[PDB]
Write a protein that binds this DNA or RNA. Structure first.
Ligand SMILES: [Mg+2]
Ligand SMILES: [Mg+2]
Ligand SMILES: [Mg+2]
Ligand SMILES: [Mg+2]
Ligand SMILES: [Mg+2]
Ligand SMILES: [Zn+2]
Ligand SMILES: [Zn+2]
Ligand SMILES: [Zn+2]
Lengths: 220, 195, 89, 37, 129, 56, 63, 151
RNA sequence: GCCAGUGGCGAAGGCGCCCGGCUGGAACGGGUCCGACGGUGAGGGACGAAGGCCAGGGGAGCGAACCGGAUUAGAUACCCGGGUAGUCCUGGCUGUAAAGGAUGCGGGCUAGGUGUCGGGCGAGCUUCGAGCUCGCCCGGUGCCGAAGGGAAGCCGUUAAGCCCG
RNA sequence: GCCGCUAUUAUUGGGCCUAAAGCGUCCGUAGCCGGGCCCGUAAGUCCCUGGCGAAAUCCCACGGCUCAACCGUGGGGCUUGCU
């Protein structure tokens, strides 16, 4: 986006390329080992992430440190951002104030952006269009064990509110879940969902399965 | 067949260590009755040729060579002054590759660590970037996160000077910054510490 | 152990979801409905259509083909789908 | 006895050896007043 | 003790695929291990397998190609009529025609797909996806 | 669309934020060796498809 | 492929001749019994925990 | 193979190489090999000892490879195979000697356990050999009858 | 006793002066024999530290109970001096323990490094020693450790990993 | 009060070092699990077919009470199955 691009000086090799007009697509950003240390990169190549909608704050916790002279409180903020196609990121941010924590969490989210596979793999849609995920997938963080299953079109997101938010930002409209562990731990629940969505890429396939499951790696 | 054989063996390149590694027994030629393993100079020579081609295809300033070890601190410095190859002899200064808020922030395209166990810092920062790692490895080195390996004593003043001298020569040869290799002028004694 | 006539509408799993409430409030004002009961009745109609369609996707012939045809011609007759329609629709 | 390491802990408890000994004294009294007196 | 060379073979393949090995060796070979590998080759999960012969039960050398996520034995070798594969798929596989359930039938060892197109059931013995 | 790269060792379709690496074949050029994180950290040898230079 | 595939013997059968009669005789390198010449009764290999210690093989072969 | 009462994963043993045909360096034919087997059984050697001697002295690997038959098959053909099988016999002799020791040494409970395990093995093999016919069905281990048996 | 050890043997409990006798089990080596004889085991049985009990002996030291001296506000204790049972032997009963690797047993797979015990192999050295050093194989016993696992601590080819029971 | 929530009964699908939880250890009976090849049988298993598993109830379409509920026509399913 031109707006941030003007104000932005890159500071990184990747940012130099982006500014220079090279690496014009976030797909060219990803699967190369590259190091993203710049939400400005992500905003340039994915401007819909700059939007208050398409941003989601998922948890705010007041955490305590003890000292002589009493309690010193910090704010942990779990935020997610995403383009409602196939890109989503998740970040934690800490601050002495909630607003600092929020902007930091969103920056780290844009840095932790990932690219996911979308499709249709349920026995009872077979629509070959990317409303769900193409195959069941699993993820974990802490005690939380999230198992996402493809669902039919119009089902909705059969998952807790955190997963609803993250999957909406990632463009998944329909899904079934089975969960284990402590889902009342929002951080680890969210990371488990996130890691499942990345395991969509970790899973292997055969040639024709792309066509039959409607597999889509980013935008459609 | 460069640098015939006795210059290698005088530098002590074939000399390994009492410890071994299965990642490196491919290169280990034998073990002698004292418990010390010996590397194959033929493989050393081959891998040096390939490293030369590789780093020649790379851009000069994008090359970074690090050496915590002092015996390599000097010849890495000379390698840099010869090739344009971002020498880091001292301590790596954690954040050189990852924190853009350091003074000397470097985002290279390849890395020439002299010993991975001593340069574990640079290794993991390069890992995070996703750049290749060329490494000098002795019989006790693991090949984790090493995309090109060169067998070497990697603890000797000599043999470090010689390996870096050979690399510089082969890089310039493959860049055509020199014609036939004998047109190289620099001495190994210049690459060496000489205490 | 007999029949026991059952409701033909389903109530929501949670009564106080802000999203569902807003959505349903809008629908009820737009279509001038007396009852959430009435809305949920039509939602349940839809749900049953969808479940049949699902089953018949994941079904095999000589029956479940009859029911495919029956579903589609019923929905055509009701005016929810065109005649060239499918379970995807 | 069947015992419980949980009981062996002391966070809000009396020592289990001595709880045990008390239990056994009680049991002895009961056995004593049951069968012969 | 040793029980089900087939399960051991499949678990070995699974673990070797996780660590990126190119070839595995399956030591207490069997005609069943061979049929299962025939099927896995035909459906494109492994590459090339050859029977090495010792004086013992024989070995299989199996060249992999990086197309296995989970391969395993359905060890209660479950009887399955020709119209229950939907359910067993939903239990063992992630999407509707993703992997392969291997079925022993009276007409040989087959995939559930071939079993369906033949209208014959049998006993489930393995899954691969 | 765009293509997804694939390791020369594992053949397992490199992922977005993997600590992977890519570089041309030494002794061949003309070939992009892709190398996944698992393969790098476990010292899984590769081999150029055009040439047969093995490498770590 | 190496050293466990098709586990093969390290022992060898080897042809020896006694010093007294000179009859060539096949034997085993890792014997459990003192091996005696079939003609003279002379010990050709004395048993040990492993590889037997060989007497009387000055002209030797191994298969 | 301390397994079965010690659970050590010992691997000591023989490594027969795969051989579809006999070796060419071998001198003896099936017939004279059989003759040697019979000779040694008359000398009083068990089948295991016979194979050991034919391996060490005569350079015969695998009488089975040579003849196509086993040593106990050869013995039963020439009417020399043991009445009860050798392994069982060996266990019974051990048990009897140990019974004697334990009568003169009642407090050697560790050797008593060794006896228990020995008799357990006996019972196992008896079960198997009854099932396969190498013993009558009515056969049963008993210490005193086994003493008479050995003696 | 010192030697005596992340040492060894043993199912565990546990086992240390030497010599002789009887005896158990394991590892290694093994082109030896048998030919699936295997695993686990409800129930059932055997073994099972200290302590305690029955009977009979013995009784140095230590020593519950007890007896005295102190201490202390008190001191049914800690400290001191004594001291019964007991600790030892014989034969029995008891059948409990932080009986703990707080980790049931078997089998297959998933990087290794470095020690150490035992056997074997190959080299080198030797004062030519049942000697020393190096390497390799098998089996034990430890530390570390990538991947991996896990709530984490930590585990990590002696799994708390994947699979088969 | 029952189901669900509850993968807090776990076949699917739970756990047992430190949180509840590996018998003190071993031995072994029933039971369960069982290496590889060949031949046979065809008991389980699978396919096809005959006879049964009432009606109502369940699903679907179509018709009649204004529609619906209800009722009828027909198709299918259900009965643990047995043969
Ligand atoms: Mg550790
Ligand atoms: Mg409960
Ligand atoms: Mg639980
Ligand atoms: Mg506990
Ligand atoms: Mg009926
Ligand atoms: Zn790979
Ligand atoms: Zn190449
Ligand atoms: Zn002679």
């Amino acid at each position: 986006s031109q707006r941030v691009l003007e104000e932005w000086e890159p500071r990184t090799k990747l940012g130099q390329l982006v500014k220079a007009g090279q690496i014009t697509d976030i797909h060219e950003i990803f699967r190369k080992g590259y190091q993203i240390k710049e939400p400005e990169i992500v905003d340039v190549l994915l401007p819909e992430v700059n939007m208050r909608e398409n941003q989601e704050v998922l948890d705010i916790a007041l955490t305590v440190r003890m000292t002589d002279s009493g309690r010193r409180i910090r704010f942990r903020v779990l935020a997610a951002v995403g383009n409602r196609d196939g890109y989503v990121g998740l970040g934690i941010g800490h601050g002495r104030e909630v607003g600092i924590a929020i902007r930091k969490a969103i920056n780290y989210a844009k840095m932790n952006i990932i690219e996911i596979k979308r499709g249709c793999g349920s026995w009872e849609c077979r629509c070959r269009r990317p409303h769900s995920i193409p195959f069941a997938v699993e993820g974990k963080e802490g005690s939380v064990r999230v198992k996402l299953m493809p669902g039919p079109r119009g089902l909705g997101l059969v998952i807790g509110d955190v997963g609803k938010k993250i999957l909406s930002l990632a463009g998944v409209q329909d899904v079934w879940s089975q969960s284990l562990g402590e889902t009342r731990t929002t951080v680890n629940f969210a990371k488990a969902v996130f890691n499942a969505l990345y395991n969509t890429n970790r899973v292997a396939i055969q040639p024709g399965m792309e066509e039959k499951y409607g597999i889509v790696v980013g935008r459609e | 067949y460069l640098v015939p054989l006795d210059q290698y063996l005088a530098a002590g390149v074939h000399i390994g260590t009492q410890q071994k590694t299965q990642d490196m027994k491919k290169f280990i030629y034998r073990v002698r009755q004292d418990g010390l393993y010996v590397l194959d100079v033929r493989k050393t020579d081959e891998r040096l040729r390939t490293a030369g081609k590789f780093l020649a295809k790379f851009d000069p300033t994008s090359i970074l060579a690090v050496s915590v070890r002092l015996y390599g601190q000097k010849p890495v410095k000379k390698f840099g002054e010869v090739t344009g190859a971002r020498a880091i002899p001292g301590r790596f200064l954690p954040g050189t590759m990852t924190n853009p808020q350091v003074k000397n922030f470097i985002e290279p395209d390849v890395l020439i660590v002299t010993d991975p166990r001593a340069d574990h810092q640079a290794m993991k920062e390069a890992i995070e970037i996703g750049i290749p790692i060329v490494a000098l490895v002795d019989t006790e080195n693991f090949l984790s996160y090493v995309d090109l390996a060169i067998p070497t004593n990697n603890k000797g003043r000599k043999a470090l000077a010689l390996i870096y001298w050979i690399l510089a020569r082969e890089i310039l040869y493959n860049r055509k910054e020199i014609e036939s290799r004998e047109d190289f002028k620099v001495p190994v004694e210049e690459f060496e510490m000489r205490i | 152990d007999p029949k026991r006539q059952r409701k033909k509408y389903e109530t929501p799993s949670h009564p106080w979801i802000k999203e569902r409430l807003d959505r349903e409030r809008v629908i009820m004002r737009k279509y001038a409905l007396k009852n959430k009961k009435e809305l949920w009745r039509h939602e349940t109609q839809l749900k049953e259509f969808r479940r049949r369609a699902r089953r018949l996707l994941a079904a095999r012939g000589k029956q479940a083909e009859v029911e495919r045809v029956q579903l589609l011609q019923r929905l055509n007759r009701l005016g929810l789908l065109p005649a060239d329609a499918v379970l995807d629709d | 006895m069947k015992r419980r390491p949980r009981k062996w802990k002391k966070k809000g408890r009396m020592r289990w050896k001595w709880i045990k000994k008390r239990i056994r004294r009680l049991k002895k009294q009961r056995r004593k007043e049951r069968g012969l007196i | 003790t040793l029980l089900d060379p087939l399960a051991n073979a499949l678990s070995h393949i699974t673990n070797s695929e996780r660590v990126g090995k190119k070839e595995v060796y399956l030591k207490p070979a069997s005609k069943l291990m061979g049929e299962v590998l025939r099927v896995m080759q035909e459906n494109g999960y492994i590459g090339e397998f050859e029977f090495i012969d010792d004086g013992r039960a024989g070995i299989y050398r199996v060249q992999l190609i990086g197309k296995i996520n989970k391969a395993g034995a359905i060890k209660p070798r479950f009887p399955v009529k020709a119209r229950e594969y939907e359910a067993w798929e939903k239990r063992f596989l992630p999407a509707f025609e993703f992997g392969i359930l291997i079925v022993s039938t009276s007409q040989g060892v087959m995939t559930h797909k071939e079993a369906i197109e033949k209208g014959i059931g049998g006993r489930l013995i393995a899954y691969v996806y | 669309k765009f293509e997804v790269p694939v390791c020369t060792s594992c053949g397992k379709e490199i992922t977005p934020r993997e600590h992977a690496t890519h570089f041309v074949c030494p002794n061949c050029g003309e070939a992009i060796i892709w190398r996944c994180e698992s393969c790098r950290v476990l010292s899984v040898p590769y081999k150029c498809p055009k040439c047969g230079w093995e490498g770590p | 492929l190496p050293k466990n595939l098709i586990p093969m013997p390290k022992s060898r059968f080897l042809r020896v001749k006694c010093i007294d009669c000179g009859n060539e005789q096949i034997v085993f390198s890792n014997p459990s019994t003192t091996v005696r010449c079939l003609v003279c009764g002379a010990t050709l290999v004395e048993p040990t925990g492993g590889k037997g210690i060989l007497k009387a093989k000055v002209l030797e072969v191994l298969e | 193979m301390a397994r079965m009462h010690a659970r050590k994963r010992g691997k000591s043993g023989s490594k027969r190489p795969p051989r579809t045909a006999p070796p060419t360096w071998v001198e003896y034919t099936a017939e004279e090999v059989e003759g040697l087997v019979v000779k040694l059984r008359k000398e009083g050697y068990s089948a295991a000892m016979i194979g050991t001697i034919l391996r060490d002295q005569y350079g015969i690997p695998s009488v089975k490879l040579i003849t196509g038959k086993k040593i106990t098959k050869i013995l039963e053909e020439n009417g020399l195979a043991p009445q009860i099988p050798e392994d069982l016999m060996a266990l019974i002799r051990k048990a009897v000697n140990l019974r004697k020791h334990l009568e003169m040494h009642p407090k050697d409970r560790h050797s008593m356990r060794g006896l228990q395990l020995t008799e357990s093995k006996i019972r196992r093999l008896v079960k198997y050999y009854r099932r396969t016919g190498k013993l009558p069905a009515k056969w049963r281990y008993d210490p005193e009858q086994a003493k008479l048996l050995v003696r």
